[PDB]
Amino acid sequence: SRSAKAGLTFPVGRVHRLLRRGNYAQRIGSGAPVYLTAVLEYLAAEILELAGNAARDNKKTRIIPRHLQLAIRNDDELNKLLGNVTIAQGGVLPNIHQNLLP
Amino acid sequence: ARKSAPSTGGVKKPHRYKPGTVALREIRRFQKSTELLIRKLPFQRLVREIAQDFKTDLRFQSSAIGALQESVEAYLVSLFEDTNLAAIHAKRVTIMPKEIQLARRLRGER
Amino acid sequence: LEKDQVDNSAATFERAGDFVHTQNENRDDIKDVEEDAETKVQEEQLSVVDVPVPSLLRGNLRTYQKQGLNWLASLYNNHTNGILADEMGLGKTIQTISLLAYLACEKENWGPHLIVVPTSVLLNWEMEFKRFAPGFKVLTYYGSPQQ
Amino acid sequence: KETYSSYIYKVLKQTHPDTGISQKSMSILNSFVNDIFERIATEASKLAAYNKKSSAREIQTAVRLILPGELAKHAVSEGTRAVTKYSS
Amino acid sequence: MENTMKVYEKLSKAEKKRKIIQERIRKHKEQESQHMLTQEERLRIAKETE
Amino acid sequence: NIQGITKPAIRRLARRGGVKRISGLIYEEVRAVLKSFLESVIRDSVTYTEHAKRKTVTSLDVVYALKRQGRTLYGF
DNA sequence: GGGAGTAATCCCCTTGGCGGTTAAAACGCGGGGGACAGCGCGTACGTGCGTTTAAGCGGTGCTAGAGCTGTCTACGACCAATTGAGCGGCCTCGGCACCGGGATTCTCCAGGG
DNA sequence: CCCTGGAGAATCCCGGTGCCGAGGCCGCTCAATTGGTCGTAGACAGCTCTAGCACCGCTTAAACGCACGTACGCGCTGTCCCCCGCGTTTTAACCGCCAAGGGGATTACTCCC
Ligand SMILES: Nc1ncnc2c1ncn2[C@@H]1O[C@H](COP(=O)(O)OP(=O)(O)O)[C@@H](O)[C@H]1O
Ligand code: BEF
């Protein structure tokens, strides 16, 4: 199919069909059907690595959504590029002030 | 002992705990909590009691009420953090409406 | 979806066991008569032996209690179950107390047992245990949140 | 109903194969995929609106416009790899 | 990410040490006392409870 | 219903919010503002329930209202 | 001889209070952290200073990326079509769920020195 | 007073039991790129264009320091309000109870083949 020809894991034929149905502009270059798919796989792969190490931190083989929140909230860049989304099963990272605790 | 009991009662004893340490332990235990806290059934009761004003026969779904609960519950917590930081910025470790109004007028209510 | 979701249970075996009661009862209503005749003698014969354990128990077990305890003793020994039918007032609680005493004295096993009785009978069972076979260490259950 | 469940499982096995999943995480990752895609596409279209236009370069420059450079360099490299593989 | 990996590794080593020490404690406590089944002092405990 | 979020519920929400001491004249205004927010979101939800005059409200409607309200939410 | 609404059966499925509970919400207060009022202080800006000073002001000679045109070719729309990525019941077994077990240290009370 | 014992116990992690969960297996099933053309539009030269670069150099008005000098955030203090935790009390859903309809159909009846 399209994945073997492109040599990429995430399907791009369906993604390119969705982009064509989008019709965002008159000139839609079809030569890169997997560019957005490539960037999303890279982002999701680094997110998955962060979530995996977070889950292995607390002897949790299965990724609890709290681990996902911790993974997406422990990095300055990740919170900078999006910080206005409230994920299900919340809970901010632990914090304390120099005045509340001795 | 109110009545027949395992021998002599009153084992509870005067064991009052002073605040601060109790407050610290309860906030520490509450922070790790990640699931819903307020009762959902009164929430749906109130949201249906405040939906017929627009129109009746609107009907609802579990996904809907769940999403509104998630939206309201995950938004006021950041407000609580902002109010607490504005409070301990001044010499007021307790919360009063002054710093919450401060947070409202710095977070762009309009 | 509820009807289909519940329907994933089915029944596989005794639908064939019903066949011996269909038609003109086959040659199986007579077999049921013979089965009743056989089980009468089997129940009146097997393990009706008066082998009690009158130890650790306060008081005596009545004649009906004595004749009924052996049935439960056989059920335990023969690895069989049963349902006790009795008119209230004869003291099946005393039967249970005597059975527990028999298991405690005749055999070496005591074990943590479970009793499920209506809420207004918890204290009645407690004082029955206190009055008869008090050797057992009894635990109650009130105050679910803390106690 | 073409979802990304198979692709998500593939990327899971690629990154952390030993790690399992929840029953609602896949919805979160699918939302990440498609919402990032549509917002990036909308920014690209709004950027191309001014210039007269009636591909790889547009997507790459849209990525470099707003998305951080730390990720933008990797995005450009992987996009070049993908387009070269497609032309291969 | 490597800091998280080494933190996880040291957490695993501490968990393994706790496993070893608690398992040793449990094994020592298991073989120290086997007396609940004797059928002799049971009369004494029954009399005390009565 | 005015007393939906009751006093202990608001108290434990505040404790989850990391406050040392919570005074007894702070929950009224917080309740007022959250009721205003709830009225806004339900008004939007009923508006897009009549986008196709659908006779039911679902998660799509509320996520629409919240995503155009500026307070984006995730977990779905 | 043989099949389909009508009569009938199935098997819970409805219906609404209705007892009996165990989880929460709303009480009261001794003290007790928590907020608030007074007084000095000290330092560090507000200013009115004499003194340089750096963008303004006015005009210039172009010039280097910008505005801009054919145009023509690299390239964006193009519909057959087929087997493949994948999407859907299903069905198992251990990661997770929840609670007790006991050492370290967290922490506060009764002393020792 | 610092230090030691002495106990409730958080946390750790392990159990210990119950379950439901990712994905494979069977089924099939919808579209991506080949295969080509229609046109088209965006960069290759060509012309140009237009005010920006930097320049000229006084000239007030920012740079810019300093002594009077006092204003109030904060150091302490006293003065003193009501947050917070132990013991009680009043709602609240939920498991059932009860019994009269629920409803597609096919399998006696009778009308179709
Ligand atoms: N040995 C006894 N002495 C006095 N009362 C007895 C004795 N054995 C049984 N009972 C009575 O029998 C009652 C037991 O009731 P239960 O076991 O529920 O049904 P049943 O009435 O069939 O025994 C108790 O109320 C108890 O007072
Ligand atoms: F008749 Be009873 F209570 F067994």
Helix axes of A13-22 and A35-57: crossing angle, nearest 10 degrees: 120
Please give the radius of gyration of chain A, using alpha carbons only, rounded to the nearest integer: 19
The amino acid at residue B108 is G
Q: Sketch out chain D's domains with CATH numbers.
A: 1-88 (1.10.20.10)
User: Which residue's entry shows tokens 């901010």?
Assistant: A92
**CA F30, CA F4: separation in Å to the nearest integer?**
13
SS3 content of chain C, % helix, strand, coil (to 5): 50, 0, 50
**CA F41, CA B103: separation in Å to the nearest integer?**
21
Q: Phi and psi dihedrals of B27, rounded to 5?
A: -70, -35
Give the number of other CB atoms < 10 A from CB of residue C10: 6
Give the number of other CB atoms < 10 A from CB of residue F39: 12
Give the number of other CB atoms < 10 A from CB of residue F45: 26
Contacts of B52 (CB under 8 A, 6+ apart): B58
Buried b (16+ CB within 10 A) or exposed e, C62-80: eeebeebbbbbbbeeeeee
Protein residue with least CA distance to atom 4, ligand 2: C86
Q: Which residue of D has its CA nearest to F76?
A: D28
Protein residue with least CA distance to atom 17, ligand 1: C92
Chain F neighbours among B 91-110 (CB < 8 Å)?
A: 93-97, 100, 104
Contacts of F34 (CB under 8 A, 6+ apart): B72, B76, F5
Looking at the structure of chain A, the number of domains it has is 1
A70: closest CA among A78, A59, A61? A78
D7: closest CA among C16, A37, B23? A37
**Termini Cα distance of chain A:** 63
* Inside any domain, residue A51: yes
The upper half-sphere exposure of residue E43, i.e. CA atoms within 13 Å in the direction of its Cβ, equals: 4
User: Which residue's entry shows tokens 């930081």?
Assistant: B85
Dihedral sign for Cα C101, C102, C108, C109, please: negative
Sequence positions preceding breaks in chain C, C–N over 2.5 Å: none
Domain of A9 in residue numbering reads as 1-85
Q: Phi and psi dihedrals of B109, rounded to 5?
A: -60, -40
Per-residue DSSP letter, B91: T
Give the CATH number for residue A69.
1.10.20.10
- Report the residue from F18, F20, F74 with minimal CB separation from A86: F74
* Inside any domain, residue A48: yes
Q: What is the pairing mode between strands F21-22 and B94-95? A: parallel
Helix axes of D69-87 and A35-57: crossing angle, nearest 10 degrees: 130
Residue D82 · residue A35 · CB < 8 Å: yes
Question: How far from A22 is each of A16, B63, D43, D48, CA to CA, in Å?
Answer: 9, 28, 13, 15
**CA F41, CA F64: separation in Å to the nearest integer?**
10
Protein C25 CA to nucleic acid H113 C1', in Å?
39
Question: How far from E9 is each of A47, A50, A53, A54, B10, CA to CA, in Å?
Answer: 20, 15, 10, 12, 49
Q: Which residue of F has its CA nearest to D31?
A: F76
Per-residue DSSP letter, A94: P
Q: Phi and psi dihedrals of C72, rounded to 5?
A: -65, -35
Q: Which residue of B has its CA nearest to A99?
A: B88
User: Which residue's entry shows tokens 């990272």?
Assistant: A93
| Residue F52, SS3 per DSSP | coil
- Report the residue from E37, E47, E50 with minimal CB separation from C108: E37
What's C18-36 look like in SS3?
CHHHCCCCHHHHHHHHHHH
Residue D71 · residue D79 · CB < 8 Å: no
User: Which residue's entry shows tokens 């009224």?
Assistant: F28
* Contact list, A93 vs chain E (CB under 8 Å): none
What are residue C98's DSSP bridge partners? none
Contacts of F19 (CB under 8 A, 6+ apart): B27, B80, B83, B84, B87, B95
What are residue B95's DSSP bridge partners? F22
What's C110-134 look like in SS3?
CCCCCCCCCHHHHHHHHHHHHHCCC
Q: How many Å lie between the alpha carbon of D68 and the closest alpha carbon of chain A?
A: 7
What are residue F21's DSSP bridge partners? B94
Q: Phi and psi dihedrals of A65, rounded to 5?
A: -60, -25
* Inside any domain, residue A41: yes
Method: cryo-EM
Could you tell me how many helices (H) and strands (E) chain D has, helices first?
4, 0
Domain boundaries, chain F: 1-76
Contacts of D67 (CB under 8 A, 6+ apart): A39, A81, D40, D75
- Report the residue from E39, E46, E47 with minimal CB separation from C108: E39
Burial (CB count within 10 angstroms: exposed 0-12, middle 13-18, buried 19+), residue E4? middle
Residue B65 · residue B44 · CB < 8 Å: yes
Q: Phi and psi dihedrals of B95, rounded to 5?
A: -100, 135
**CA D25, CA A48: separation in Å to the nearest integer?**
11
Residue B107 · residue F37 · CB < 8 Å: no
Joined tokens for residue C77: 């020994």
**Termini Cα distance of chain F:** 29
Q: How many Å lie between the alpha carbon of B2 and the closest alpha carbon of chain A?
A: 42
User: What is the enclosing helix (H) or strand (E) of D60?
Assistant: helix D56-66
**CA E20, CA E38: separation in Å to the nearest integer?**
32
Q: Confirm or reject contact between F52 and chain A (CB < 8 A).
A: no
Instruction: Give the dihedral of Cα atoms C89, C91, C92, C98; nearest 10 deg.
Output: 180
**CA B9, CA E13: separation in Å to the nearest integer?**
47
Residue A25 · residue D49 · CB < 8 Å: yes
Residue B79 · residue F7 · CB < 8 Å: no
Residue C69 · residue C99 · CB < 8 Å: yes
* Inside any domain, residue A99: no
**CA A33, CA A13: separation in Å to the nearest integer?**
7
Where does F1-76 sit in CATH, by number?
A: 1.10.20.10
**CA D64, CA A77: separation in Å to the nearest integer?**
15
User: What is the enclosing helix (H) or strand (E) of F21?
Assistant: strand F21-22
Ligand 1, CB within 6 Å, residue ranges: C 62, 86-94
Residue A44 · residue D32 · CB < 8 Å: yes
Chain F neighbours among D 23-42 (CB < 8 Å)?
A: 24, 27-28, 31
User: Which residue's entry shows tokens 């040291």?
Assistant: E10
Dihedral sign for Cα C54, C57, C58, C62, please: negative
Query: How is D12-23 classified by DSSP, letter by letter?
Result: HHHH-TT----S
Which nucleotide is nearest, taking the CA of residue B19 and each C1'?
H84
The upper half-sphere exposure of residue F66, i.e. CA atoms within 13 Å in the direction of its Cβ, equals: 24
Protein residue with least CA distance to atom 26, ligand 1: C91
* Inside any domain, residue A97: no
